[PDB]
Structures are given as structure tokens and as C-alpha cells.
Amino acid sequence: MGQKIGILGAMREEITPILELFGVDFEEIPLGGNVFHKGVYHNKEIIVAYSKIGKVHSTLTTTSMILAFGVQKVLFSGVAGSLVKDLKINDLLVATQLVQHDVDLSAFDHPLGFIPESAIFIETSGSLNALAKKIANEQHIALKEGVIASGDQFVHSKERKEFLVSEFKASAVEMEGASVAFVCQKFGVPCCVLRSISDNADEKAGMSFDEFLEKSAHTSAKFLKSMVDEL
Amino acid sequence: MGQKIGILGAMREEITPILELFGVDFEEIPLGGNVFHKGVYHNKEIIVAYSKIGKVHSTLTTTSMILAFGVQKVLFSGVAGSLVKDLKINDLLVATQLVQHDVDLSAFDHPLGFIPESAIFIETSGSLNALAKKIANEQHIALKEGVIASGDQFVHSKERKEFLVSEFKASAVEMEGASVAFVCQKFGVPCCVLRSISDNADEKAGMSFDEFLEKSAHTSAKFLKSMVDEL
Ligand SMILES: N[C@@H](CCSC[C@H]1O[C@H](O)[C@H](O)[C@@H]1O)C(=O)O
Numbered sequence: 466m467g468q469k470i471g472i473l474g475a476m477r478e479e480i481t482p483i484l485e486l487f488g489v490d491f492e493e494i495p496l497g498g499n500v501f502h503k504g505v506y507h508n509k510e511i512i513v514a515y516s517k518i519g520k521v522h523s524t525l526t527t528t529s530m531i532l533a534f535g536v537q538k539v540l541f542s543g544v545a546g547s548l549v550k551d552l553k554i555n556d557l558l559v560a561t562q563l564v565q566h567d568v569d570l571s572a573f574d575h576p577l578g579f580i581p582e583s584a585i586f587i588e589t590s591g592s593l594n595a596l597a598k599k600i601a602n603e604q605h606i607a608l609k610e611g612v613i614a615s616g617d618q619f620v621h622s623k624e625r626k627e628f629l630v631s632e633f634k635a636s637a638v639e640m641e642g643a644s645v646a647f648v649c650q651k652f653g654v655p656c657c658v659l660r661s662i663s664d665n666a667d668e669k670a671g672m673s674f675d676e677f678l679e680k681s682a683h684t685s686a687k688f689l690k691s692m693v694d695e696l
Numbered sequence: 697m698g699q700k701i702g703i704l705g706a707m708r709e710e711i712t713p714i715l716e717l718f719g720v721d722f723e724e725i726p727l728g729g730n731v732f733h734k735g736v737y738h739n740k741e742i743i744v745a746y747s748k749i750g751k752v753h754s755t756l757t758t759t760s761m762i763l764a765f766g767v768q769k770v771l772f773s774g775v776a777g778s779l780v781k782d783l784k785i786n787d788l789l790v791a792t793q794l795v796q797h798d799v800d801l802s803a804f805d806h807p808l809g810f811i812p813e814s815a816i817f818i819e820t821s822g823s824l825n826a827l828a829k830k831i832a833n834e835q836h837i838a839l840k841e842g843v844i845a846s847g848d849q850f851v852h853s854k855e856r857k858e859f860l861v862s863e864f865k866a867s868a869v870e871m872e873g874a875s876v877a878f879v880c881q882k883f884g885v886p887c888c889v890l891r892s893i894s895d896n897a898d899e900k901a902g903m904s905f906d907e908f909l910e911k912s913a914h915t916s917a918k919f920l921k922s923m924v925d926e927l
Pocket residue numbers: 475476517518519543544545619639640641642674801804812
């Protein structure tokens with residue numbers, strides 16, 4: 466058999482298209498409040514789950530994928546808010562680095578985003594990111610490679626947008642990427658975080674999110690499947 | 697053998713007194729960026745670790761304790777900031793409920809602290825909390841039983857204090873309790889979160905924290921050991 470691949474989304478809506486697109490039989494396995502969908506695709510074992518929203522949920526689920534299911538790589542798919550003009554609704558990006566944008570130990574003179582015995586930016590797999598870029602070029606689609614800021618707030622203001630851009634030079638904002646990538650780094654598991662834009666993280670982001678969740682989730686899922694087809 | 701007990705702190709300073717007070721031989725086992733100290737005490741296996749600071753770190757470590765080490769209960773010990781007048785420096789409390797105070801999905805009209813498919817407040821073990829209160833009464837020490845607010849910021853302002861009290865009726869603030877308790881709930885593992893006050897979460901909290909970290913960490917550790925002696 467090939468590698469075992471963990472495939473993660475945050476919301477059920479982000480994994481529904483994944484399960485459908487792979488099209489194989491899945492066994493449902495409950496653990497730690499999550500349901501893991503276990504299947505075989507192109508002689509690879511795939512484990513698919515949605516974590517539920519936010520850093521604690523996604524940390525837990527990623528740790529379970531690694532410790533309980535023994536996945537050898539983790540691919541994340543879902544939606545995100547755009548922080549840069551060149552990322553429009555439906556556009557894709559892969560995260561070259563991620564940060565937890567809501568971490569604040571400034572009382573002890575630490576840079577924002579920094580925790581002692583850790584680092585501001587978390588790295589993802591250069592190999593998987595390069596693969597994504599090659600596939601995007603072949604398919605003639607744009608693919609941004611940039612910084613993703615993750616936090617436990619849904620961002621919907623110009624003020625917070627300006628902070629994420631100024632402080633971290635982030636291209637998109639979401640609520641799980643940094644934590645998924647962090648867990649993978651700690652266990653030496655290659656990680657790729659893929660997102661499709663659903664909104665502009667501004668005052669109208671809630672309504673945009675609702676309008677575009679289904680399409681953007683599908684766009685990311687279809688691209689993730691394209692990557693697995695090359696693995 | 698009795699139960700297997702996981703014992704968790706956030707910082708090395710919070711577990712140093714734990715290792716010393718138990719006084720037994722520990723085997724050091726690395727996993728996921730943490731070092732787990734495995735020992736035998738009063739015919740119980742104890743697994744001691746510090747997670748590192750914050751929600752992602754503590755979620756990961758608690759999940760590892762459960763999935764990799766098979767702990768049957770988790771006791772947390774460390775320091776916290778006081779939000780109520782009757783909790784003074786060095787005073788102890790156990791968390792009856794915890795909340796992630798920095799969670800904000802208000803863009804979708806959710807109450808602060810709420811995430812879909814979860815709950816605002818996380819419960820801890822009534823049995824362990826009752827045990828703590830009984831021990832405190834016997835030792836003639838005060839022990840508050842209240843709400844702990846956890847987030848990824850070190851709180852050091854009157855404004856944020858007023859929010860935690862008004863929104864959640866929290867008695868103390870820290871950076872790991874809610875996430876540790878959350879993981880334990882998801883896996884059906886009894887949890888007790890114990891904290892000793894190190895500061896008042898106000899403008900001077902940084903300096904107070906530095907002054908009292910050692911003593912407050914020891915106070916919590918000594919009390920945690922008192923509980924294990926009854927288990
Ligand atoms: N409208 C939903 C909340 C979406 S929070 C934004 C999510 O989308 C992206 O995957 C982020 O990382 C979060 O998981 C609800 O009200 O249930």
C-alpha cells in the first residue's frame with residue numbers, strides 16, 4: 466500500500482464534497498467526539514473527518530488522526546476570508562506559513578503570536594505545496610502561496626483585517642490552519658493547508674460566507690482530490 | 697494497580713514542584729514535543745508533563761496523555777489570575793465549569809464563547825471537586841469552587857477583567873484549563889482543574905506573576921499531591 470493520508474475539514478460542509486468526490490466506501494469510526502471516515506482510494510488508506518470549528522477542536526482531531534489512525538500526511542481543505550485584493554471569492558491558496566493571530570503574551574514583552582518554547586510561524590510541507598502549485602499551473606488556475614492567520618474569532622471588520630496584514634503579512638484568515646499545521650509539525654507529519662475564499666473578512670463577511678460556503682468548499686475539495694491523485 | 701493518573705501543568709515551573717513532592721523515580725518519555733515523566737506512586741501509575749502555554753499546546757498534550765498513555769483521570773495544577781476580591785494571592789480554587797473566553801462567532805449571532813456542536817461551559821468531575829473541597833476543609837484552607845475563563849492572552853487590564861466577570865461570571869483567568877477539561881470530556885476522562893492565584897489580571901499582573909509564580913505553583917502542586925494521596 467501507499468501512504469496513509471489524513472484529510473481534514475473544520476465543518477461537515479467542508480468534508481461532504483470530499484466524501485462524494487472520492488466516491489469509495491467509508492467505514493465510520495467514532496473517537497473523541499469526532500467521526501472518522503476510513504476508506505481505500507488508489508491503493509491508499511484515506512481517513513476523512515471534520516474537526517468542528519476552532520483551534521481546540523482542530524488540535525484534538527489532528528492529534529487523534531496521528532496517534533490513533535497513524536496517518537503519514539495531513540491535507541486540510543476548507544474555506545477562508547481574504548485579506549488581499551488578489552484573492553477573490555473562490556480563489557485558492559496554500560499556506561506556506563501559519564500563525565495564531567490571537568495569541569497575546571505582550572504583558573511579558575513577547576511579540577504578538579509568540580508563545581515561549583514555540584515560534585510565531587509554523588511551516589508546512591514544501592513538497593506538498595510545490596505539488597499544489599504544479600497542479601494549479603497545469604489546470605490553468607491561480608494559486609496563491611502565502612501566510613494564513615488562524616484564530617478563534619470569525620473576522621468581520623476592517624480594523625482586524627488591517628492588523629492581520631500589518632502584523633503578520635497574512636493573505637487569508639481562518640480558524641484551524643495554524644493548529645492543524647502545529648500538531649503535524651510536533652509529530653513530524655507532512656502537512657498541507659488548502660483554502661478557498663468565501664468572503665473578505667469585512668463587515669459583510671457573514672452574509673458572503675453563507676452565500677459561498679457550498680461552492681468554495683467544493684472548490685477546495687476538488688483541488689485536494691487532484692493532489693491525492695498525484696500522491 | 698489503582699487508576700492511572702495524568703498530572704498536567706502548563707509551564708515547567710508548574711511541574712517541578714510536582715516531580716519533587718511525589719519524590720519517586722521518573723522515566724522520561726518524549727512524544728509530540730512534550731516530555732512525559734512516568735512513575736509509580738502508592739501503587740498508582742502517574743504520568744506528569746507540562747504542556748507549554750495556551751490552548752493548542754494543552755489540547756495536544758492532554759490528547760497524548762489519553763491516547764498514548766491511557767490515563768484514567770487528569771489532574772491539572774498551575775497558577776491563575778484573580779477576577780474576584782475573595783481570591784487573593786496564593787488562594788486556591790477548583791474549576792466547576794470552564795469557558796474559552798476568547799471564542800467569538802458573534803458575526804453569526806452566536807453567544808460569545810459558543811462554538812457550533814459544542815457548548816459555552818465545560819464541566820469537570822463533581823467527584824474530584826468534592827474531594828478537593830473535603831481535603832481543603834480538613835486542612836483548614838479556603839477553596840473556591842467557581843468558573844474559570846481560559847484564553848490565549850495573558851490578561852492584564854481592568855477592561856478585560858470586567859468583561860470576563862460580566863459575560864461569564866468567571867472567578868479566575870488562565871490559558872489552559874478550558875482546553876484540558878474539553879479534551880477530557882470528549883474522551884470521557886474525569887478531570888479536575890486546580891489553580892493558585894499569582895496575580896490580579898490587572899495592569900500590574902506581569903510583575904505580580906513573576907514575584908509569585910514559584911510560591912503559587914508550589915501551593916497548587918502540594919494540594920494536588922494531597923488529592924492523589926486520597927485516590
Ligand atoms: N456560519 C457557521 C460558523 C462558521 S465559522 C468559519 C469556519 O469556516 C472556516 O472553515 C473557518 O476556519 C471556520 O471553520 C455557523 O454559524 O455554524
